[PDB]
Design a protein around this ligand. Sequence first.
Ligand SMILES: CCCCCCCCCCCCC/C=C/[C@@H](O)[C@H](CO)NC(=O)CCCCCCCCCCCCCCCCCCCCCCC
Lengths: 41, 423, 48, 153, 499
Amino acid sequence: WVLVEMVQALYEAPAYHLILEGILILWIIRLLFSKTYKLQE
Amino acid sequence: DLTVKEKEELIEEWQPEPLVPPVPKDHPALNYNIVSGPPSHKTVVNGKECINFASFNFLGLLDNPRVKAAALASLKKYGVGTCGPRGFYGTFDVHLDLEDRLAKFMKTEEAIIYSYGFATIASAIPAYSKRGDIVFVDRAACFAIQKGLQASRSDIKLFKHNDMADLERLLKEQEIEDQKNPRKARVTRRFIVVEGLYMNTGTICPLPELVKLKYKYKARIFLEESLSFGVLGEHGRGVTEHYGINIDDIDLISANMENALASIGGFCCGRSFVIDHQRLSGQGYCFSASLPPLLAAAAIEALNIMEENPGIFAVLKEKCGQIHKALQGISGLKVVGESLSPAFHLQLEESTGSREQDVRLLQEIVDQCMNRSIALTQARYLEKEEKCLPPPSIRVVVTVEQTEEELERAASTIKEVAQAVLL
Amino acid sequence: AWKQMSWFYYQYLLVTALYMLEPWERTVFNSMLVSIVGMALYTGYVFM
Amino acid sequence: MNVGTAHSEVNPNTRVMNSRGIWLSYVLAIGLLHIVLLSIPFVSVPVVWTLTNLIHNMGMYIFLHTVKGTPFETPDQGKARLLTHWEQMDYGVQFTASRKFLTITPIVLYFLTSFYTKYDQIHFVLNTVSLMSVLIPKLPQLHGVRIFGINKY
Amino acid sequence: IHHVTQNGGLYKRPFNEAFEETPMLVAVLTYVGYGVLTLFGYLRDFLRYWRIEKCHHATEREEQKDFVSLYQDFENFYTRNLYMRIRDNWNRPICSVPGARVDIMERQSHDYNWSFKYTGNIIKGVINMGSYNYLGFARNTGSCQEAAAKVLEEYGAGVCSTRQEIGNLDKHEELEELVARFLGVEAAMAYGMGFATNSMNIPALVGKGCLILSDELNHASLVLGARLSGATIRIFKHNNMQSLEKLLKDAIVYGQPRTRRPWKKILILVEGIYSMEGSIVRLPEVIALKKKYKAYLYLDEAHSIGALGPTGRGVVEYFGLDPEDVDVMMGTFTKSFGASGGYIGGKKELIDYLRTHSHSAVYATSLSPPVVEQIITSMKCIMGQDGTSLGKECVQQLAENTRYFRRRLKEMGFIIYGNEDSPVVPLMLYMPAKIGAFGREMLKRNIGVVVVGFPATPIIESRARFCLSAAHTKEILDTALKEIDEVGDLLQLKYSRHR
Ligand SMILES: CCCCCCCCCCCCC/C=C/[C@@H](O)[C@H](CO)NC(=O)CCCCCCCCCCCCCCCCCCCCCCC
């Protein structure tokens, strides 16, 4: 039974390891709302 | 932007152009000649018995009894149509026999046959040339070569007709381009496209000077010889045999089976390394029905006759050196083409002003000659769709079925009526 | 029995496209599939 | 066999990633790679999860951002001969469904790999450097660029 | 009469097709095979460097080693790694007249299809379902053959000139007058090759400033003609009228791409029957939509003429429409008449313009006389100008055979594409190894078929194609169906869910 140790590491996870994860989530959402648009000409 | 009311009006306002443009009946054409019966030595054109100097069967073989007998025996065995595209049950044992036979005639490794003479070279060029390649082409190339070069979206450089001082200048300009971007120069392929016995001018290409350029600037040669195959050489192999040039130096040879073989279709010959690529990438070979077997059985018999006695190429050579020598001295007409060619031209000296005036002058001589048993034609082009448009001319075509007496009779008659229309 | 075994193996050859592979090429795939299954059966016994 | 026989698409390489059943087949392959790595006896769970991430990103980079051209002859005369597979997808149209799926999948795999590693300091460097190398080429601004002229011809 | 749509299309009888979707498990299991084949192809290409020599492939000359290499190597990865493994299914030579039964030449290979050799034996009577022989005119007895031999005796096999110089005989004038009465149009012209009829005539009608709207499944010659014209090309989805109308509407209100000027003209390219797909065009809707937006229609009936219609007059007669609503009609003589060549029909001013401005009429050799006579004689049989009734029997027998065969295949569990009246029958094979196994298994039972794979089609849509003929009897079809049923259990091809 090893599950709670990882959740305990989540809380003690360094701040710079969660700022990046939050930034990546904010990029997924922007990605899911972008339109099509052919490159250029 | 752009509401639903506007759009309805935009759609109703539009009016297209007609599918075909108006004002016909000013063209020189649209008045096809009608031939009654086969176009043999003695024919009937527009209801007049005459000797023809306009068909392209240099060796006879159109109405040879042996060829007809060989075609009938293959008609009685297979029928007429090959109902399939050569890759789904469209290949007969006669096709495999004809390709194997052509390879032995030309002394190459392999051959491939197309069912249409115009498609053979129009499909072969785009199979090797792609968007990033450079092709050097003679300015006087025929229409099928031009269409093949347009299908392959490569870079086309034209050089002057039959001078290597201009081809070498272009090739050396390519070296400067090569030197300032070496990494791009290692992925670009170079081709030289020439022809033996040019259809549009009647002259022959200088091959020994071109094979030496090939090995100096590393460019491959594509030789289109549908007018010299079965004509030039001691055994009729074409322009390589005329100069005594090793055929391994060429990389591709293309001809059609409709001029001296008097049949339908075309072929390409060469090494397996180059030939095997067209069976999976030639458009007219993959997506078209194969050649009907009675037409292939007629080409095999023609090859048999050609091999059995090669003295026929000697009678054709000295037959055409007489009428070329007889037509020297006509006032107003100049002869264009080599002495060893069976299909030279006859062009108007000191032109008038327009092209329509010249064509009207030439048709008068043609129609006047048809009244004295001599059937001739003038060359026909698509004026707007030509890279370089040749001058108006009359075709004089020599075949082994013409007697010396009627050969000199034709030359006297042309002079008589050309000095009373051009005076 | 034996004939039924030959048919299941024939189906296996058709699904993996090993039917059109050469005899030495089939041996490589069979070896690295049997070894991976055998090495999984061991870990799923010593770790459970 | 020959392009153009049953369909008229001039480059059949541009529509593969939109076919039926391929988004599920692409996820089952990650699952199979993970199960095969999990069976090594002399290895711990965090190392298994780091190996899964690095191998997936490495293979993805090679197949989508390194190999250029088509594996067959097309009738457009070699138009796409200098482009990678990512650049030919949907004829260059950006932000389609498949380009969104293939961009979101690595991020989701990275989120799981971080959690099953206990946010270790050593592993974080490897996983982040591996993830960036497969996200930079997917930016619309890098369509057609080659750094220092690498993998150009 | 029967039912009409909202565009204006008028149907007189029901029009029903079916394209069942590939099941998910089967779709997954084909990517496994393609992936395994790709992985082993990379290993073989790697081994070809410094290992097993494979001294069987052709190589460049020694004197041209310092040239740039002739071929791009990554192209024909598929040729040497997938196609070569099953290529004993395609270029099979025959030594007999092709129809309803054919002789095959036996060939065997010892180096996995890198070279072949003949065993000297011939497989006698193989059921032919791979050749285009509708109406059964491909034979070596009868009146057509007799007339052709008669003409061959006096004319010869070849012409040695072009229609515009001395290559216009009276047989061509006789044929072109008969095709016009067959189609019900004003004038017609004959060419000499079916691929050439499109690729050398389409560029004579459109150029810069014109728009071509092409269907998603057109033949290679139509695409090549469109590429050589110089116009703009846009593709719409197969038989989708909602898609073509949207494309045609957006074309007129925004004009040309950069300059934004109005188009000079718009041309739509379609076909009567799509052979590999088995479907028939929705001609009434296309005609009703072409009239409202002032476009021009180009119809390609290589597979429809003779095969469809209550009397054999193509897809226009099949829907009951008027042939004068189609601007350009073309077809070939290779699929239903037993001959070779092509034609174009239309108004008299279209044919006068084509007779002076098409590439074929100026630069190409004209039709062979013996081939022309066989077309004349076979067309006069279908019309009924032979004094016999052999033209009505073949037309009825083809329809009877199609209904019977198609219906019996659908109730054994196979997946079949197309329209119920189509004489081409695609049977869905999905897995890449079953492409190579099906052709071998069927030939082992004396049946000849055609199979097409991934590069030619879509990735999960491989298939086999069956061509039905009027020369197939009921016992021949019973034998073929009996063997198909057996092979479908052997290879597990009964994929249909909504049986
Ligand atoms: C051993 C298991 C085999 C499956 C895994 C093997 C992975 C190999 C992937 C192949 C890479 C190709 C992807 C991109 C290729 C492009 O670069 C090239 C050049 O541009 N173009 C091409 O057109 C490539 C050839 C054709 C493209 C697609 C064919 C290959 C696509 C395969 C789809 C995914 C393959 C993995 C499926 C494995 C699923 C396993 C799940 C469990 C199966 C049992 C479930 C009951």
